[model samples]
Target: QLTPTFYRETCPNLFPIVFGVIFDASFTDPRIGASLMRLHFHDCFVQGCDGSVLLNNTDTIESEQDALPNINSIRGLDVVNDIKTAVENSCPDTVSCADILAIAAEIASVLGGGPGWPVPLGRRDSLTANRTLANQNLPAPFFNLTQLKASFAVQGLNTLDLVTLSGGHTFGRARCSTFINRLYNFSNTGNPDPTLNTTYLEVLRARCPQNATGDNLTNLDLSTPDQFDNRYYSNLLQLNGLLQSDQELFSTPGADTIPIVNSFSSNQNTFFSNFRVSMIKMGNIGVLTGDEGEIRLQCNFVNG
Candidate 1:
């Protein structure tokens, strides 16, 4: 099992360095908190948080960052690389980019007014990233309830984890391109998604016209877009979820996800408490440790 103190003996300055850099980066990049959370999620979903998402295209490595799901969406690598450079500067040979990502995400969440958890470390970097797995594994914005549940099932995350982690949206913003179809001719039906709240749909339409050349940014949590909270679940109950996958949690008829969504919406503590656990559980997916993979010096490429 991974431990929070996994690097205490080897990299004493680990947390401070991660915190310092991430906090500093957040000043310029306020979205850094949500960005790192996303990077960690995308990383964990494929190759088990090995920093495969951080890799660039090498002679052999087909960077997961290039996958369709990730191509223009997944970001914050520049921040992570800056963190990697800083960590490598202070702690010589202990910290992996993978660990840096997990730790930074925790720090980012806390900085963004979200609950903090002790991130389990000792994850090693993936030698070769998988583009195919990245596309096939990460859940999509348009996914229906069953498809969303099935995607999480592949990672051993249950309905609780699904609703809990979806709370990550509380602080993140999404591109209009991801959910624009819902605003106009959803499924090419010549109308917006019926599940969308009428007023909210108008607001979205104003922000993102039916045929806009620009991909505008909209807050996932309209109430508090930059803060981590249970409002994401509450928004779902009001039919305000930005993504179809998001609304389905509460919109699906008699869906198992609805109760948890109800619970979290009514009680923020319940969502906060569940958030860390689900995060850790998701963090544990496909992790490589104890010589299984290398503590890569460069997050973007494997070692010799």
Candidate 2:
């Protein structure tokens, strides 16, 4: 079983070392707070938080980073590498990459104006990456309510967890390509989507044009984009959710997530409490522990 103090005896300074990198990096790159948290989610979802998503390409190991959902989309790797380096220097071979990921995700959430939860640690890294599962498992921005529900269910997460964890979208940025379909070209079709706020669609169109090659960036949260808060839920109530996957949680008829959204938007503490719990639940999936997998000195490679 994982515990928050898993590294207390072996590496007392582990928490501060990780916090420092994320804290310093965030002063300039405010996005790092959101980026790292998503990185942990992507890592956990693909291979159960074994640091499988962090591996680079190798002759024998196909990196999960190359997966369609991750390539160029997951950010803050430089900051994560910095944390790993600092930790290895302070206490070499004491902290596992998977544990580092779990720790840093908590740090990112709190630093981004969200709630903090004690991270369950002692997870070890896997030697091989699963590229195909990365593609298959990671939730897409194009997903509807049912698709989104099924994605979370794979991890044994419930609907409440789905609504809570989605609150992570409150602080990051998404490429126009992820949501462009919601604001498509004027083919004289009635409206693109009735759920999408027409006014917000115009703003998105201006921010990310159809001809812009889809590289343009848009804030995940229109109001207070840098702050991780309940506005993500409020944004959805108005149909201002940037991603179709998110908007569908509230817009879909007879949706169970709608009531949860209402509770989160109306009360920040409710979302915060659930988010804290759900994140811990997410980090527990597919964890390696107690010599099950070797801890690597370099997070990007297998231990030799």
Candidate 3:
């Protein structure tokens, strides 16, 4: 079980320390704010907020970072490492990486000009990591509305969670390869996805040329990529969302996700409020507690 005051007596300065680390990291690269939030999302979805995402590949365990969804995509491990070191110095072994990641995600969201919410704590680290599970579980950028709903539903989430949390895309960038097929050959049609705005498609094609060599990049919300605001919702309304999975929230006809997208786009405050609520809900998935897990001294490995 988690509580807002989980570390009140043991680590009174926990929030300040973690927030300080995030502030410093954000100064170096504001985009890192999004990465940290994403790191927490990836962590929770897999074996439940147990910090398994931080683990490195060992001879016996395949790291979650090697999973298809995370390969060359996830970021902010160093910041988490730095937080772990700082927390250990203040109150040795008092904080779990899972909890640190959760708090850091809240900080990152706030720093990125998004909502700030009280994150419950006391999550513990896992003894195992699962690469295959991650590959199978995490929602892909190309998912349609049905696929999106099914993915979230498997995690005990609903269509609202799907649309609300998808708003996180408001803060980050996506690799061109993640969506290039929609640009040149969606569904093997050898034609761009008709749903995409032609002007935006041209912009994407310029940077992600049909035969681009390296990973090209584009902001998920071209309107206000740096700010975690409702512009991403607005982008979808215009058929300019950077990812197929994103626009699908609004494009999929007769789909339940469309109204929620419209509600978010019309009211930024509602999106912000619901985002925090849904994030808290998502954070609670498959949590380990009551001696079910351990407080690791290092985040990347199980204690020996």
Candidate 4:
């Protein structure tokens, strides 16, 4: 069913090298680029890269998740398609779209302002996609710390893994509709969130009416909305995190890792190293590699 050619002794280089290429692209900085890469890659690899990260039940084609703001016209799927198009144009049907996805994420990290590392070639693409599976695997906007940790833990990720993975929030944007609930209603219930920026929240509420259905966007990591830094963790520590899933990182038992979260918030290198390991781990799950899968001509379909 598959042609097993590539094997061990090469799995380590799969994420870093692609990031190097991304540095060559316009973004040129690893902070934002790598953070974006981590989020998208984690989304796909969380379940196993079937392009499910792009699907939304209400949309005709794939839709970006509501947690992360859709950047320009570029989001997870656009990045995937960009790499897939490059591979198909340069190598035809020899390389896998799945690999392209893995590699593209690496590049995105670098492009967004991150460190460069080695990324290996030769991952194979999957032929099918499941939006339901994606929805189940990805975290929900309303998940608390316990449920959030459980979601990652169920995927064989530990607390450190969960924190490391969430570090990617530094570079994405969110829709007003997605996080307006947390900002306004959070007040309605009188939650202990007193650290939110008064002016920012007031401005946000003014632009986004409570009952409106506008697709207004906001930054998930408002502290360094465009930078890929540990400000995300700092935001959580201050009770200023936008997504319920994000605040849970600092609010739950994993709060012990708050120091580690603080380290990442202060040092970019710590976040990068941990993120790299997490991506590699995420990419290795039940993947149909070696001879078990095919190098696809198109990401949407498997080559025969």
Q: Pick the candidate with the highest lDDT.
A: 3
Tens digits of per-residue lDDT, candidate 4, 1-304, equal 1222342343334333344444554454324354446544544544565443443434244444543433242344544556556544444566665565666666665555665455544555554454445456666667766787788777778888988877777777666766667565674785424545566577677767777766786677667666656677778767777766776666666477677777887877778888878877776665665576565655543443
Write model 2 residue lDDT over 61-110, tens digit each, in one string: 88888889888878777777888888888897778888887888788778
TM-score of each: 0.97, 0.96, 0.97, 0.75
For candidate 3, the 10 contiguous residues with the lowest summed lDDT are: 140-149
Q: Encode model 3's per-residue lDDT on 175-258: one tens digit a residue.
A: 878888988898888999999999998888899987856987778888987988999889988899888888877888887777
RMSD of each: 1.2, 1.6, 1.1, 5.6
Query: What is the Å distance of residue 61 in model 4 from its true position?
Result: 13
lDDT of each: 0.85, 0.83, 0.86, 0.59
Runs off by more than 4 Å, candidate 4 = 1-47, 50-79, 187-199, 252-254
Show how many residue pairs clash in every candidate, following the order shown.
0, 0, 0, 30
- Candidates 2 and 3, the one with greater lDDT: 3
Candidate order by TM-score, decreasing, is: 3, 1, 2, 4
